[PDB]
Amino acid sequence: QEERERNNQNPWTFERIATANMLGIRKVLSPYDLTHKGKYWGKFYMPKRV
């Protein structure tokens, strides 16, 4: 997982957008999403999310 984050070719990540309030995305997000960084949705954990 640490390797996947480093070599990810996508220039946009959940952490970058959520923290910076890009596109006003925090209106549809949660305060926990700043720390979960998109890897957790409810009780489900997504290992494929970088």
Partner: peptide, 28 residues
């Protein structure tokens, strides 16, 4: 509730955010 036993459907703006921010493995 925020946490549900079933997979709760994401808001369309959130779902678009998840799709754009998907892992792209490097291609040699």
């Amino acid at each position: 509730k925020a946490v549900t036993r079933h997979r709760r459907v994401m808001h369309f703006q959130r779902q678009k955010l998840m799709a754009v921010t998907e892992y792209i493995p490097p291609k040699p």
